[PDB]
From a paper:
Because the secukinumab:[name] complex produced crystals that only diffracted to low resolution, it was selected for further engineering of the CH1 domain isotype and C-terminus. Four new constructs were created: an IgG4 version that was five residues shorter and ended with the sequence DKRVESK (“tagless”), one that ended DKRVH6 (“tagged”) and an IgG1 version ending with the sequence KSC with or without a hexahistidine tag. The IgG1 versions gave a similar number of conditions with crystals (88 tagged and 43 untagged versus 54 for the original). In this series, the IgG1 versions behaved better than the IgG4 and yielded a 2.7Å dataset for the tagged (at 10mg/ml) and 2.4Å dataset for the untagged Fab (at 5 mg/ml) versions directly from initials. This resolution improvement is probably real as the 3.0Å dataset from the CK1.0 (tagged IgG4) construct was obtained after optimization and screening of numerous crystals, rather than straight from initial trials. In addition to the improvement in the resolution, the Wilson B-factor improved from 94Å2 for the CK1.0 construct to 52Å2 for the tagless IgG1 version, and yielded maps of significantly better quality. Interestingly the tagged and untagged G1 and both tagged versions of the G4 produced isomorphous crystals. The 3.0Å Secukinumab [name] complex (and its 2.4Å improved structure) shows two Fabs bound to the [name] dimer with a discontinuous epitope, each Fab binding portions of both [name] chains. We do not yet know how general this result will be but believe optimizing the isotype and C-terminal His tag to be a fruitful avenue of further improvement, especially for complexes.
By engineering a small secondary structural element from the rabbit light chain constant domain into the human kappa light chain, we dramatically improved the crystallization of human Fabs and Fab:antigen complexes. Alignment of a human Fab structure onto a rabbit Fab showed that the longer FG loop present in human Kappa constant domains forms a bent and bulging conformation that would interfere with a beta sheet packing interaction. In the case of the FG loop, this consisted in replacing the septamer human sequence HQGLSSP (positions 198 to 204 according to Kabat numbering) between the structurally homologous T and V (position 197 and 205 respectively, according to Kabat numbering), with the pentamer rabbit sequence QGTTS (positions 199 to 203 according to Kabat numbering). The resulting mutant is shorter by two residues, with deletions of histidine at position 198 and proline at position 205, and is referred to here as ΔQGTTSΔ (positions 198 to 204 according to Kabat numbering).
Numbering used by the authors:
A (entry chain A), B (entry chain A): 1 to 230
C (entry chain C), D (entry chain C): 60 to 161
E (entry chain B), F (entry chain B): 1 to 213
Write the structure that this text describes.
Amino acid sequence: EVQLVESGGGLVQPGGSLRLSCAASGFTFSNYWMNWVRQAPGKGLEWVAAINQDGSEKYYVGSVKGRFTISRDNAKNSLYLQMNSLRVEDTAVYYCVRDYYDILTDYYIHYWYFDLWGRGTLVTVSSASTKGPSVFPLAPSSKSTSGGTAALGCLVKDYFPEPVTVSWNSGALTSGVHTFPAVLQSSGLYSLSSVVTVPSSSLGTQTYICNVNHKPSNTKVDKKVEPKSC
Amino acid sequence: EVQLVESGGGLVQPGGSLRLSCAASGFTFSNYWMNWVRQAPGKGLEWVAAINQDGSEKYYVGSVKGRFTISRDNAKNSLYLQMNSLRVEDTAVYYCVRDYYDILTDYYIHYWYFDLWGRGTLVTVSSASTKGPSVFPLAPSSKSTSGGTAALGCLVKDYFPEPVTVSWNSGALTSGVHTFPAVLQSSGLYSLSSVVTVPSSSLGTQTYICNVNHKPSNTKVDKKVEPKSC
Amino acid sequence: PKRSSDYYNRSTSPWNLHRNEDPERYPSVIWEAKCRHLGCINADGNVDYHMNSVPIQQEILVLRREPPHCPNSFRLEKILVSVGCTCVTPIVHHVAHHHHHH
Amino acid sequence: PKRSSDYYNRSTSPWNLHRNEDPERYPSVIWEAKCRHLGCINADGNVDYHMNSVPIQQEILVLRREPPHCPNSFRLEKILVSVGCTCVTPIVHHVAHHHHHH
Amino acid sequence: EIVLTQSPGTLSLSPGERATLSCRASQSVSSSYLAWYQQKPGQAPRLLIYGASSRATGIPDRFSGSGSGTDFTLTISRLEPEDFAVYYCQQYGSSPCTFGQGTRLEIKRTVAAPSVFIFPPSDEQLKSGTASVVCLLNNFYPREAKVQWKVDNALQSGNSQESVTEQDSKDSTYSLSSTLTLSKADYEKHKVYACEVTQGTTSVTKSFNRGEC
Amino acid sequence: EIVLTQSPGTLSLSPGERATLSCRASQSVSSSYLAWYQQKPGQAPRLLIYGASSRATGIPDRFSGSGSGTDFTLTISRLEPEDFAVYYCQQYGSSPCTFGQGTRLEIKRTVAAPSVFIFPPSDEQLKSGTASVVCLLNNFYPREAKVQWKVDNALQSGNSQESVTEQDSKDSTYSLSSTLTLSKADYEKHKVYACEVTQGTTSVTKSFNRGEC
């Protein structure tokens, strides 16, 4: 039942500002120290900032000195991180975390480890503009060159920021689907492919449509992938 | 006129104790912070311990934790270093030093640098016993093989601890004398040579005696160096 | 007359003293310590933000004339005052007995 | 009722409070801070001897009945008491204005 | 700052096997204040161990921790499919709290060769001025495979990017995409497009001739 | 702890020349709190500079200091014979106060070949069971010389020790003693004792035949 839910994440240009919020529920929020912990895409965990029960003490990692400010509202069960003068290396998923404590006699003992984590919020710091993807077909041949199995797909190119969702035939096709993790191109835009292996005899009898959703630009692309017949 | 004079140094076995004293004169001792700084033979300077004006604050280097104790007697213008559980790596010349200070308005500003140094006291930590040297002649040939110049000397061997003094003809011979710095042998005992180059024609007409003094063992050796005639 | 302590300037959690003046107070001039930095000054002289300067609080007895502007004999009161600052971290540390009793 | 400060245990210059009891005192029970270590506890939890734990002193007003065993109305006195400890070094450090005012 | 070094970077074991994960600290951790976290892809970390050896609430008996000072271990006596994740150690004996860089625990299965497919750029993309050539390596094991691009037999360098899926929950395989990016003008100047996949002592080259069936 | 690295280890210059001594700190020194000391053999150090650039009392104008952060310099505009000593930098901006390992400033003069002498052990020492063979290199420059011992043409290793005097105040030369230690039994088993002194492209071997004139 205990939960931490972060919000406030998004795309911001270098030098910009962003305020993160974390809603705590199911426990006495004022009894705990809280922290912000971040994780750059495909990298490790990194401590950002700590705050004690009443916010009389605030601690920060060396890299965010004078730029980030941690705060809390015990009546609103909320934790905040004010992020100013944002840098490209601040790009990460930010986690709201709760610290374990003990009560020995009438003394409160804080331990700097986290018994509860939120789901995180993605913060992208970049000068690249929000753009919906350009969806291109990865067309199978009408006449197979791989026995009874044919591969087909969609190349989801030049979109920004993350994330995109890819489904096939409005979710009716899930088996043998591989949606690849996005790669950041040298242009600062993402690109990914979503593939599926199907029986080559089905190419004439079955329609294959990839449904690409890109919530940051509010763009949805439905692309029918047709066999490349000669 | 200002001076710092250390005493208390000597040979001590590993695990032993020694108390160093430093007598201050020519200035108001109680106005200054004082330190002990050491220098292992042929090595650099190293901070040991600091003490403030009234001895309410005492600071120590990592390597002497729980073993050394710094103290002062402002009425006796004295500084002390109590050295317990002495180790072989504690072997060094120990310097008593005075720290520079300023008075800005009515505020005292201590600076951790030394405007006055004592002459130092040698502390030798070793299991080797005090022993006087064995003095051997470095005899010149009666018939020279180096033109008009002959070298002669004394090999001052197997003495402990340092120092020894070497003179020639009770100090009457100083020109062309080379008394080499002592080397610690693998036995834990010191050895040195003292040489002199003289005209080879003087070998028959002049007596050459090296006077070796070793105050730690209260031994004095006078060795006449005679030509090795065939 | 001994030189008043310079701990406020040599502390790793330095502080400044603010003067508090009131005619309805004994002592009338009160010195309150305010921490200089959020962090603490490390051995190298730099501010570390994984440590905090916190003010040490003490309950002091002050004389209050009731009714006002009448000094002779009455009943005093208690007031919390910041004496100085100390350096804290989020960790409760444990250290061996030979380092203790000093 | 707020939890009394744990700074004495989380400080880099920790201290213990010693009870002082006398019938000729107001308050009769006085808590004096005594520094735990000569050194200070570094970030790693170890004692550093190039730093010192020093007690912060404060002048407190205490009531003293003259002649003894007579409490009503008289004249009080001042006493120096150790409130807590701070960490000092032999160096007076200087740090930029943006790290100040906190 | 205490630096935590985790070993190995990747651990390949099968369900039923014992897992030993190491965490080495650059300096002694006070009071053995070392925690372990498990993190599965797309999810937040979850506390497993605290105080070097104590299990967090709801953590099964197969997870155990040991160590003091600078050397710490996380042991999983008998691996279950659900235990394959990334594991992070974290110290809280020194300020600031720091984490290790993680150990990824992956399922060891039998070697499986991939089904290789090559896709020319779509004619639709070609009108934008860019040609993306895609090579798909479908359901193979282990994760390590060498993908090389050849254009009219000339080996390509610096103009491709790869992406690998998470290990398949059903057959324990990986799939890999390699994308070759060229301008339309460069793509039209050449004929043979080849994707060469090497896995051990075997190379499989899947190719096409531009503008040919 | 701030580590101070001094450069060069040894500086060879003549009186009248300008000396530049470097001190590099591993981390920035607060408020440029860097001092310099001069130490002559057998004497205590003496303060020259404080606060990176300020001269101590009685220090002549030819001594000057500069620098901030991590890089500091000691300059002697025109060297005088009295300035040839060991120089130490010391920081007092970080606790604990630390020193550099020193720069020895030695007088550069013309190359002088040494007068080589060899001495057999005394018959008096031989009755104690040990034979010390002494080789003297008298008044040479520079300090660097290769001394090798040969016993019946067999090159010796690990059974000799060298000692070098301080630079001569009058002619600016060095003298060197090399002592070969053997047991009486080893000494009596061999005939030819040779001390080989190499200085550049020249080797001088001074020898004797045991029990011969």
